[PDB]
Amino acid sequence: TLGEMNSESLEVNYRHLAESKAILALFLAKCPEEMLKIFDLVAMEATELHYPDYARIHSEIHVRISDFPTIYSLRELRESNLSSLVRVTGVVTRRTGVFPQLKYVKFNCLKCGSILGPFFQDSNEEIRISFCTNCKSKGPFRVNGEKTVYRNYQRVTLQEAPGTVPPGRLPRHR
Amino acid sequence: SLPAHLQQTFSPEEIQFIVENEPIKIFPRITTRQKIRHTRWQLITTDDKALNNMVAMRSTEVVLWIALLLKQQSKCSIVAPQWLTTKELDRKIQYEKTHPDRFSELPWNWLVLARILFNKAKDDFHDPIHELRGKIQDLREIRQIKVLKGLKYLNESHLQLDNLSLLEINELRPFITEIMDKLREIHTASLT
Amino acid sequence: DAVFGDRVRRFQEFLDTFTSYRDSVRSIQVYNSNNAANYNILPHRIIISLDDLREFDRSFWSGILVEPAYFIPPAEKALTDLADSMDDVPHPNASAVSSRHPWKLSFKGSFGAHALSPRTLTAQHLNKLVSVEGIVTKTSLVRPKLIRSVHYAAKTGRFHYRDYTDATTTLTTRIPTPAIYPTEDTEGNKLTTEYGYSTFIDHQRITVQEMPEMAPAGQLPRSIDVILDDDLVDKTKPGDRVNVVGVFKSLGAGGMNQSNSNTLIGFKTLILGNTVYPLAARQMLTDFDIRNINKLSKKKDIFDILSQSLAPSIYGHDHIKKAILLMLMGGVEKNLENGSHLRGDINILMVGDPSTAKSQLLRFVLNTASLAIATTGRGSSGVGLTAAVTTDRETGERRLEAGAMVLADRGVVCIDEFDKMTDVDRVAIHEVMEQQTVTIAKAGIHTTLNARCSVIAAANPVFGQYDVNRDPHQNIALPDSLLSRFDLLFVVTDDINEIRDRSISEHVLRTHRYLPPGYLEGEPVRPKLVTIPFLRKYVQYAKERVIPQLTQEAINVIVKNYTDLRNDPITARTLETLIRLATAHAKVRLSKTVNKVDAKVAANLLRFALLGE
Amino acid sequence: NDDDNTEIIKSFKNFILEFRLDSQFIYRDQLRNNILVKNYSLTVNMEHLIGYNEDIYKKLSDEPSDIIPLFETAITQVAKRISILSRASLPTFQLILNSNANQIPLRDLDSEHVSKIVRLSGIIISTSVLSSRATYLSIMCRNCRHTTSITINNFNVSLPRSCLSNCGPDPYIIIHESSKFIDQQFLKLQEIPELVPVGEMPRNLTMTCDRYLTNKVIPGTRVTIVGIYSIYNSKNGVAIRTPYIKILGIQSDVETSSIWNSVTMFTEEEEEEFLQLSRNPKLYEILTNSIAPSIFGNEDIKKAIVCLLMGGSKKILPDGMRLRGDINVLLLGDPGTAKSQLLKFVEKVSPIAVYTSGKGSSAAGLTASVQRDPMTREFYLEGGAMVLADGGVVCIDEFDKMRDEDRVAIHEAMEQQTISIAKAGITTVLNSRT
Amino acid sequence: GYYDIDDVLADGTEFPCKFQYDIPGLGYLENNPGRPITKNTKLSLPLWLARILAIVGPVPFVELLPPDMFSTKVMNAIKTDPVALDLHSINSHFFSLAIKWIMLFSEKELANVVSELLLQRAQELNHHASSLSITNIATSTFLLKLEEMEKEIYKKSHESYKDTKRWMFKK
Ligand SMILES: Nc1ncnc2c1ncn2[C@@H]1O[C@H](COP(=O)(O)OP(=O)(O)O)[C@@H](O)[C@H]1O
Ligand SMILES: Nc1ncnc2c1ncn2[C@@H]1O[C@H](COP(=O)(O)OP(=O)(O)O)[C@@H](O)[C@H]1O
Ligand SMILES: [Zn+2]
Ligand SMILES: [Zn+2]
What we know:
Bound molecules: adenosine-5'-diphosphate, zinc ion
Entry title: Structure of yeast replisome associated with FACT and histone hexamer, Composite map
Largest interface: C-D, 89 and 88 residues
Organism of A: Saccharomyces cerevisiae
Distance between the termini of chain E: 39 Å
PDB class: replication
Chain A: DNA replication licensing factor MCM2
Number of domains of chain E: 1
Shape of chain E: elongated
Oligomer: part of a larger assembly
Helix content of chain C: 25-40%
Keywords: Replisome, fact, histone hexamer, replication
Helix content of chain E: 40-55%
CATH architecture of chain E: Up-down Bundle
């Protein structure tokens, strides 16, 4: 049913990882980014085992992890939940438009013939270019059209739901 | 009695008729020649001696409506003239690009005959039809540029061209004649 | 340059061919010398006709109308040389020697395709001389701009001058000067700036918006910003139907800098205004027009002729059109010694049934007045009628822009649907009707603004149709205090008839059967009666020329009529209202005295306005 | 790389010079007839370019922004070959594409279609003022006083840092006397309401036009647009570069004659067919049956609708008396008489038409509104529903329910055909012939 | 020509003129029932009266004043830009009236002006007539600015070019 309408999302129930291979669920709960970085390649290989030459339709596959057993509201988020998966209930108040974002940023050094290597974007802060691979100093950098990859980007202001907040209090915004 | 669009000018199909009434070299594919051992042709507006002496796979000279009528039968194949080659058309293009003030020494029936042989003789050209029609269009465009340049000299007295085609005379006839007629009317009203 | 000098001698040959410009320069110089040195100053500008230069040199005419940056400064240099050679003055002033404005060029004549509009100003007309027509809007404040600084060195005792160039001042592009005064000289040691010998010009930005009658379907009017040179500063007020001739120029980096790598913004485009034409609100009066005006003033029924000459398409409302005529030529204003401001501007409120052509009379007095501003009940705000405080772009300073009711000063305000103002707008309107000045105290600004303007307004009753029950409260929904300031409360009833209704029907079918002259039949549009420009000339002549004064033979009639009208909705103000009629009819007769025939007509018109006659 | 660029230029030159369908060089004749009316543009069908050479089709459709200027150079070279005699001027041209591709909706426009030619459809809601972009720049060095030239193509460059004769760090200024400029009009596109996704809002997308594509659409029309989906950086988080569409082609059957000039742009055989329709003895019943074929009865309403669509004649008198050339029709009656369906069909049939509510209306919404520009902090008038319907039809649903202050802002706009607004220091009389 | 209907509408235009004699009984010229005409009366009359009323009369009956269509403003506008001038708003049959005015008053400068104008608009007329679509705004706005004889010449040239286009381009 991923292949049926050319979808790119493969939903995985976390309870299925709880029943079998709970070490994998623990690794996903503790280090989610690297676990999903392995999991998308695993799901792409599992798709190509059943749908060969599916990479022409969608070059990268993505996995939506479903039903995390711990639900944290916006008031209950603390420092221990950083770099981890959180399940947050809230209402969306402000939604920006669709924006193209460079999945891999690469730049051309003007003074040197060498080009700067493609770096993956984390969608939090821009990649800090301290120097170049041939010259150890800052220079003019602009995006080459040799290898460019664009992905969709959209921020939403997830306000806490007013039935979820304590009565009369203020909502929280993330 | 005469229609308004045929009043002071010729229609292009009348120009087609006029250039259908010329001789042209041709290759017969039938033998009408009497041997030493068939109604005759017997025409009254052209010499029928070349048509009575029609020999297969030879060069004869017949009128162009007979040429098209027999090409429709495919009993006789029309030979293109000397100026319908790529080399001669390139020479004419070079003469047009060499002298800007003077038109090239093309025949009077160079657009009408080319259209007739393009729409009726698609397998009778030694050169390819493709670059032939390209050079025809190039000559037409550069002659259009030259007549646009020469139309700035619309004089009250007279105006001369050297080798403009009959189809280009019907291109430019009503505009030039009406504008010069009104210029002459203005100056003759200006006379005391 | 060599080509610069060649165009200099070409324009010198042109000025030698036509000696009228030399005579005008000589007249300007001798007028300045007579009115300045000896016991209101003509500036440095000449009226260049493009047509007179077209038969001289078509190359120079095409250079002016196509690439004016290389053709107008050589003509400036040639005209400056001719003005220097023509001037022969002994013992000049040091400020006169150091600060000389070059003789600028002002252009007249036919332009052809270059005579344009602010909507159709496009990128192919940049760096070309164009003539545009439109509404003046958003006049920036007059502020001086330095173009030459003169400094004195005392250790050497020498005066050093430095020229200062801007993108807007010079048609050609020069390297910009950062406007820093020279602190010290390279050889003269310390330098002291000498203001007074330095040269400053007045700088002003206006905004020419497209004339709204020429707007196409579905599009808002466009606008341009026009720089005004120091001779042309303060020639234009907002709401003026100006014709500006100037060089349509673009300036600035405009996003071509390295910071703006992929910003799709365009270049900032302006017009360096060579000349400004009013386009004749105060029409000039030839002597033949004066002869016609004084010939028709002697007729006994000139009031009737000029009344039915107003809007022949409108049938009926003859006394209303008489009041409209006395409204356009409003009465004399008297300012007393103690300071009481006695209003000479008659104001008219027309209340009544729908389709009695009150708004059509509003449109007619909009078109035929010297200055007219319209407004609507639901399309007006009280701040938007008087004045609004906003920042200015070139100054970074807060200032007022006048609203509808102030910009129509010495003019008329055409209020439609007056019965349905918001109360905030009613406060401001009532303030003008009782005070004629508005006091603005906000944004750190304490200012008073004069508004000596007339008001004609149209209204419906509080019901759907006007009642014949003569109820005082159901005439208007506005309070009676605002009713009191209106001098003539005309009420109209569309009573249903047969004969007069057939007359109005045949009149409007004769109105619809008109075909405008010079236009094809069935195509889309792209007992003496005087013409409407002649009527406007009559109104202008009566307004500026004659000031009538009041005389007893009207006065006994006026006091008898007031006692008859009041003692047998009446106000003491009605007395002043009779004066606001009576001398107004004197302005019809053009005499400087008021007689009995003005007062009888005034009493008849006010009896028609109040009682209905 | 310049060898491949001039090979592309020569190949598209050969495409213009050598294309012939049914014994006719369509593109050379198109260029000649476009030059003769001083319309320096060339309209190219994509089917014709594919039928010539599909390799050229991938060269166009792969990186369009780097090859469309090469095609522009090829068109200008063909134009100088055609209309200029050698050894005895013309500015840059414009390539306008026509495509018959399936229309990509606005919500499906995403990061996959970046720098690709897409064909879409939408509703114009705002056309901005024309801005003067530059093509030829005479760049002057401030120190050594030498003048170079920079040629600007409006795809995907700035002032360089060396003077190309220390001379100076940034020694360049721009001479505006010898610079050539083209137009650029900004547009805002709203998507088709029939193709909006479920539960969302129509997304406005900013678009641009250059040269002769400017001033072609009135706001409110429904248009199909072909163009490249490029990205430009905006002055307003991380790596957010706002998308836009550079328009290569505009098509609209509902919209005619660009900004209205009372101009006859209908073709000759369509004009003869229209004359035949005007000569029909029973065209009145044809126009009556054309209005609401799925509504029984209401024949007099259909006749009044046809009279509304044709309208009267606007007349001008020498005394300034302007009389109305439009008729306003109010359908008052019971529910279930299909009045709102007649309103919807009138909005469909009319070329300029808007459909509004009584509850969803406002005084500044139907008439023109006074809004504030964000950057300049200056008030400006933005047109409402009776400005977008100027020269056409406004339709009001539930007229009985619109507010008493809201009904009476329409009186001058119905009768005087104008809106006189004096608010916020701006006073004007806009024309609204609705 | 007698039967030229364009010439008939050309003669139907009214020109301003001055009456030289005190002529009673012609009050129907200025739509009055019976007013005798005073000395030096300024009045607009059609050309079929005033063309030979200025001939017969020595002092003739009617003096032809210079109208607005031949004023110095119109002459300067023609001399500046002949192509984009809107001749239709001035007069729909400006050229036939110009020819009649030149034949009546032999003015050489007006002859040079109208000849130069006719040449410059004939170039643009030929440019719009040779263009065949496979209508533009740039051609149809010039058709909006054309006279009746000029659109007659454009119709002749345009149908000639279109007919030879369909002859050359198809059977
Ligand atoms: N001669 C006339 N007599 C009466 N009414 C007329 C005449 N000529 C025009 N009208 C009508 O007067 C109407 C304008 O009045 P209206 O718009 O009702 O004023 P307001 O907007 O102040 O109520 C026009 O619709 C026009 O049809
Ligand atoms: N004559 C008819 N033909 C077809 N449908 C009709 C007809 N009359 C009513 N209807 C249907 O009934 C509904 C009537 O709605 P309508 O009367 O337009 O709403 P409103 O009362 O707001 O005007 C429509 O949806 C329409 O489909
Ligand atoms: Zn480097
Ligand atoms: Zn340098």
